[PDB]
Amino acid sequence: MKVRASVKKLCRNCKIVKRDGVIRVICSAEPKHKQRQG
Amino acid sequence: SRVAKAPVVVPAGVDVKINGQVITIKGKNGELTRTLNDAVEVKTLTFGPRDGYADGWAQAGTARALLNSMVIGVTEGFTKKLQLVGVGYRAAVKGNVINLSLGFSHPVDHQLPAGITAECPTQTEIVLKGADKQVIGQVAADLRAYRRPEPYKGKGVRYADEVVRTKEAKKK
Amino acid sequence: IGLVGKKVGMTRIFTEDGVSIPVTVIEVEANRVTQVKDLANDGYRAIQVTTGAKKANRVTKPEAGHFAKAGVEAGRGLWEFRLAEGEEFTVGQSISVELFADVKKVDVTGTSKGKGFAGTVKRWNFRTQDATHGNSLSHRVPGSIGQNQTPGKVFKGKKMAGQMGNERVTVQSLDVVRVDAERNLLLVKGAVPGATGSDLIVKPAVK
Amino acid sequence: MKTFTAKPETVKRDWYVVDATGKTLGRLATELARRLRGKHKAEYTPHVDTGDYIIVLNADKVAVTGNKRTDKVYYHHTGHIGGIKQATFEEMIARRPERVIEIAVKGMLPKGPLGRAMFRKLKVYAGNEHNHAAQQPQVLDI
RNA sequence: GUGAAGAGGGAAACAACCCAGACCGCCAGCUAAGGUCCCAAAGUCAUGGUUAAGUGGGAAACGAUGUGGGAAGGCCCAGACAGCGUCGAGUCGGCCUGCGCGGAAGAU
RNA sequence: GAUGUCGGCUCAUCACAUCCUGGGGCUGAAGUAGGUCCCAAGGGUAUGGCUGUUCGCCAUUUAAAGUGGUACGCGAGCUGG
RNA sequence: GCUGAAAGCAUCUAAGCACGAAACUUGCCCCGAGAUGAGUUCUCCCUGACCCUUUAAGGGUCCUGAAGGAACGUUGAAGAC
Ligand SMILES: CN(C)[C@@H]1C(O)=C(C(N)=O)C(=O)[C@@]2(O)C(O)=C3C(=O)c4c(cc5ccc(CN6CC(F)C6)cc5c4O)C[C@H]3C[C@@H]12
Ligand SMILES: CN(C)[C@@H]1C(O)=C(C(N)=O)C(=O)[C@@]2(O)C(O)=C3C(=O)c4c(cc5ccc(CN6CC(F)C6)cc5c4O)C[C@H]3C[C@@H]12
Ligand SMILES: C=C[C@]1(C)C[C@@H](OC(=O)CSCCN(CC)CC)[C@]2(C)[C@H](C)CC[C@]3(CCC(=O)[C@H]32)[C@@H](C)[C@@H]1O
Ligand SMILES: [K+]
Ligand SMILES: [K+]
Ligand SMILES: [K+]
Numbered sequence: 001m002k003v004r005a006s007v008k009k010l011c012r013n014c015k016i017v018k019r020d021g022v023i024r025v026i027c028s029a030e031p032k033h034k035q036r037q038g
Numbered sequence: 039s040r041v042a043k044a045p046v047v048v049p050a051g052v053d054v055k056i057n058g059q060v061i062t063i064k065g066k067n068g069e070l071t072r073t074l075n076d077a078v079e080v081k082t083l084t085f086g087p088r089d090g091y092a093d094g095w096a097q098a099g100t101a102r103a104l105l106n107s108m109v110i111g112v113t114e115g116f117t118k119k120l121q122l123v124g125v126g127y128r129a130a131v132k133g134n135v136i137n138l139s140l141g142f143s144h145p146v147d148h149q150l151p152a153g154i155t156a157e158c159p160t161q162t163e164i165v166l167k168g169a170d171k172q173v174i175g176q177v178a179a180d181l182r183a184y185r186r187p188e189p190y191k192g193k194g195v196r197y198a199d200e201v202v203r204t205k206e207a208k209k210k
Numbered sequence: 211i212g213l214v215g216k217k218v219g220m221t222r223i224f225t226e227d228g229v230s231i232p233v234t235v236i237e238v239e240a241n242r243v244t245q246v247k248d249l250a251n252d253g254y255r256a257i258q259v260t261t262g263a264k265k266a267n268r269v270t271k272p273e274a275g276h277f278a279k280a281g282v283e284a285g286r287g288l289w290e291f292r293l294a295e296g297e298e299f300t301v302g303q304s305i306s307v308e309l310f311a312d313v314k315k316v317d318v319t320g321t322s323k324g325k326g327f328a329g330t331v332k333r334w335n336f337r338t339q340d341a342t343h344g345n346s347l348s349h350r351v352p353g354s355i356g357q358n359q360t361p362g363k364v365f366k367g368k369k370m371a372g373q374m375g376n377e378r379v380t381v382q383s384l385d386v387v388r389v390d391a392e393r394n395l396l397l398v399k400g401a402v403p404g405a406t407g408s409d410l411i412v413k414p415a416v417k
Numbered sequence: 418m419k420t421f422t423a424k425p426e427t428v429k430r431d432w433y434v435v436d437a438t439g440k441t442l443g444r445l446a447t448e449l450a451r452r453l454r455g456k457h458k459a460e461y462t463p464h465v466d467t468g469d470y471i472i473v474l475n476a477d478k479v480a481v482t483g484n485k486r487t488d489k490v491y492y493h494h495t496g497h498i499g500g501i502k503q504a505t506f507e508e509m510i511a512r513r514p515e516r517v518i519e520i521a522v523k524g525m526l527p528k529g530p531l532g533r534a535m536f537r538k539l540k541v542y543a544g545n546e547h548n549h550a551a552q553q554p555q556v557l558d559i
Numbered sequence: 560g561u562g563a564a565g566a567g568g569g570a571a572a573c574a575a576c577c578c579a580g581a582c583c584g585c586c587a588g589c590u591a592a593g594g595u596c597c598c599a600a601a602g603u604c605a606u607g608g609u610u611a612a613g614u615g616g617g618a619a620a621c622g623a624u625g626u627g628g629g630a631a632g633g634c635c636c637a638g639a640c641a642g643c644g645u646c647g648a649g650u651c652g653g654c655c656u657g658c659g660c661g662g663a664a665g666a667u
Numbered sequence: 668g669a670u671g672u673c674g675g676c677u678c679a680u681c682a683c684a685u686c687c688u689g690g691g692g693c694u695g696a697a698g699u700a701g702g703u704c705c706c707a708a709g710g711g712u713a714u715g716g717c718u719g720u721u722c723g724c725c726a727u728u729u730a731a732a733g734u735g736g737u738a739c740g741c742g743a744g745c746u747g748g
Numbered sequence: 749g750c751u752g753a754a755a756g757c758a759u760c761u762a763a764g765c766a767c768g769a770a771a772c773u774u775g776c777c778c779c780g781a782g783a784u785g786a787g788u789u790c791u792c793c794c795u796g797a798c799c800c801u802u803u804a805a806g807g808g809u810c811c812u813g814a815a816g817g818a819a820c821g822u823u824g825a826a827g828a829c
């Protein structure tokens with residue numbers, strides 16, 4: 001999990017999702033691309 | 039929207055009660071009940087936003103999808119397959135209790151809920167069965183959670199269809 | 211439930227394999243049920259028991275009427291034990307130390323010995339300051355008791371000198387060494403609170 | 418003439434029973450506070466308790482809006498250093514549901530001896546039963 | 560300009576900010592700033608919107624299919640868009656703007 | 668028309684930007700052992716040599732030897748290098 | 749994580765459901781009804797006359813003196829008192 005103020009799609013398999021008031025990047029391809037805004 | 043708009047075909051041999059805001063479908067494979075969000079009118083079954091509800095199309099689309107699954111549930115029903123990968127990983131069903139050997143010092147003794155049923159075709163396969171799509175999903179996740187498929191050899195409990203991505207170690 | 215006994219004193223039991231077990235000897239005479247409390251009347255389930263004996267002239271009329279309702283002889287006090295769901299007792303029933311026949315461990319509650327007014331060294335294990343090296347009148351004194359203007363007070367619960375001992379203490383999970391119904395004795399391994407002759411409450415170990 | 422003042426000896430206080438079920442906590446509490454103080458009576462006198470006795474039933478079913486059921490926090494300090502304690506609204510309802518209404522009303526009553534006296538006329542119950550049939554409380558729809 | 564050398568009302572409290580300049584008395588009335596659910600005087604006022612964060616009631620670069628409004632557009636029953644030729648209505652992503660969200664750690 | 672000062676001693680109390688122990692994501696994570704980030708303040712968190720030292724260096728421990736606030740906490744509590 | 753739309757797909761979340769830590773609430777120990785919101789249970793005790801006026805939770809006289817308490821004494825592994 002990357003915890004950052006700037007969360008972004010890093011590839012075409014990344015998806016932005018808001019869960020429980022938190023912006024997250026989930027990626028099916030790359031676990032390194034998983035991000036949480038914080 | 040598009041999900042919600044499309045009504046669900048209710049077959050003969052399947053019986054649908056509607057009482058207040060409750061659906062309780064009968065049928066051969068089993069029986070199932072739910073209460074929906076108060077923004078849904080269930081009029082086949084047909085689904086639609088009630089007035090004074092901004093979420094009503096979102097709530098109707100989920101209602102549609104759940105009742106489609108419930109009417110599948112009490113007919114063909116749901117099946118989930120799991121595979122054990124790894125030397126010494128066996129499974130065995132005994133009443134409502136699956137017995138997993140998964141390389142621990144203790145045997146794992148997982149008990150199935152009220153109406154899920156397991157079969158072990160081989161020792162390295164589990165085959166779950168039930169009417170409730172959510173519950174069979176949850177049981178399958180719980181079994182996978184004992185030894186989630188690991189990234190070096192793919193060892194552990196996997197979904198049979200799951201494609202476990204593999205990697206090699208740090209180069210020396 | 212438990213029983214009320216008296217601390218007789220300490221001794222040892224030699225085992226054949228050459229272990230000396232230190233024991234407290236507890237005299238547990240028959241506990242007589244003086245009152246049964248129930249949900250309907252009292253709002254909780256308990257027995258009240260007495261044990262021992264009191265001289266008639268020291269039994270007040272209110273005390274005597276309470277014992278007379280139960281149909282028991284006056285003992286030296288009254289104690290309650292909470293009941294679990296399956297536990298049932300009747301007024302006038304005698305309960306003996308055979309209660310503990312198959313109990314492996316007990317908790318023992320007593321009144322600790324009284325040390326009177328104790329300093330911080332004894333009461334709280336404070337460290338002494340220098341005996342020498344210039345120390346002026348401050349060998350066993352407590353040292354600082356706070357900070358400065360912030361917070362400009364001493365906090366509640368500050369460890370200071372005061373009454374030590376003479377209070378209820380429970381020691382948990384003592385091994386039952388022997389239950390001797392004939393002699394009204396319970397032997398427990400190790401020390402328990404209070405002086406020789408003091409009242410003890412003995413209960414099966416909660417842990 | 419001098420302006421009328423209510424006299425503590427002669428004040429008539431009626432008994433009322435209110436059902437908290439589904440009522441918004443703070444909007445119930447203001448009406449309770451008003452009536453415990455006697456602000457609804459022409460005889461209202463700031464230094465006299467002219468208010469009514471109020472039984473509140475079903476305190477455990479009082480409502481709150483938004484995410485307050487999980488997010489409204491009740492703090493108290495024990496007086497011991499570090500003794501800051503807290504409970505959420507949902508925890509307060511589970512453990513001591515009458516306190517939710519009592520706390521809300523106390524904060525809306527005057528501070529001081531008379532305000533404490535006014536609070537004594539509020540009788541809050543968790544369920545649908547009270548033991549004050551003898552006082553013959555009138556139903557009051559707040 | 561005010562305080563100093565200026566009281567009264569407001570800004571929780573708060574010389575110097577806002578309203579306003581106390582000759583004395585009144586258990587009359589109208590207003591100012593500021594207010595009108597309870598503490599606490601006065602709208603639980605009216606009509607039309609927005610916000611779901613207790614935002615309001617501490618907030619920066621920057622981040623985001625939060626949500627309201629607006630002006631253009633590209634493609635679309637010569638079948639788009641998504642998913643699997645199927646398929647059968649819209650779909651797509653920039654700009655402008657209202658209100659929110661993250662960014663957000665401190666000592667009784 | 669006086670708000671006692673460095674360091675030590677005694678006794679602390681809070682914060683969390685966590686040293687240990689607890690939970691977890693990513694890893695250029697095979698395992699063992701690490702790196703990094705997130706959650707977490709319940710409890711715990713060296714003795715000595717040298718020097719007034721705080722610190723530091725050194726010796727030898729420890730699961731760890733946390734970082735800060737508290738009149739650089741604490742002399743109507745001690746010391747006085 | 750499950751199921752699941754908004755957004756035919758996807759999506760742990762919007763509806764709904766499940767896991768998840770020495771933190772939190774309990775569980776363990778001690779205090780504790782001045783908890784003035786002063787609670788409960790058991791037992792014990794007192795079952796006499798009369799006068800007066802500012803008729804009132806009024807005042808006094810005679811008779812009565814319980815349960816129990818205190819005091820005093822001998823004291824205590826209780827204690828500064
Ligand atoms: C004195 N009074 C005008 C205000 C007041 O009464 C209060 C209060 N709590 O009652 C205040 O808090 C106040 O005294 C105060 O401290 C303020 C600020 O500190 C403040 C305020 C607004 C700000 C807006 C923007 C910025 C940006 N900074 C300037 C540069 F350095 C970057 C800072 C602000 C700020 O510091 C509000 C006032 C209100 C005061
Ligand atoms: C609500 N209360 C906590 C304070 C308050 O009572 C007042 C008041 N006047 O009575 C305020 O003004 C207040 O509500 C408020 O608005 C504040 C501010 O606006 C404020 C404050 C301090 C600030 C310090 C720094 C900055 C700038 N940095 C960069 C940005 F990212 C943050 C802004 C400030 C600011 O806007 C004081 C509070 C006090 C509040
Ligand atoms: C006499 C004053 C003293 C006792 C000590 C003072 O220290 C000095 O003034 C240091 S210079 C004087 C030294 N000496 C005379 C040569 C007298 C102490 C010192 C440490 C400060 C610097 C000034 C303020 C202070 C109060 C608080 C404090 O720390 C004190 C005064 C108000 C205090 O009375
Ligand atoms: K002037
Ligand atoms: K707020
Ligand atoms: K410290």
Ligand SMILES: [K+]
Pocket residue numbers: none
């Ligand atoms: K890690």
Ligand SMILES: [K+]
Pocket residue numbers: 708709
């Ligand atoms: K801690």
Ligand SMILES: [K+]
Pocket residue numbers: 738
């Ligand atoms: K100082």
Ligand SMILES: [K+]
Pocket residue numbers: 742
């Ligand atoms: K000093």
Ligand SMILES: [K+]
Pocket residue numbers: 743
């Ligand atoms: K001082």
Ligand SMILES: [K+]
Pocket residue numbers: none
């Ligand atoms: K001194």
Ligand SMILES: [K+]
Pocket residue numbers: 781786
């Ligand atoms: K009491």
Ligand SMILES: [Mg+2]
Pocket residue numbers: 020
């Ligand atoms: Mg969560």
Ligand SMILES: [Mg+2]
Pocket residue numbers: 323324325326826
């Ligand atoms: Mg003693």
Ligand SMILES: [Mg+2]
Pocket residue numbers: 337338
């Ligand atoms: Mg020492």
Ligand SMILES: [Mg+2]
Pocket residue numbers: 346
């Ligand atoms: Mg001297």
Ligand SMILES: [Mg+2]
Pocket residue numbers: 345346347348349
């Ligand atoms: Mg000396």
Ligand SMILES: [Mg+2]
Pocket residue numbers: none
């Ligand atoms: Mg103070």
Ligand SMILES: [Mg+2]
Pocket residue numbers: none
């Ligand atoms: Mg006031």
Ligand SMILES: [Mg+2]
Pocket residue numbers: none
């Ligand atoms: Mg001057």
Ligand SMILES: [Mg+2]
Pocket residue numbers: none
């Ligand atoms: Mg002025």
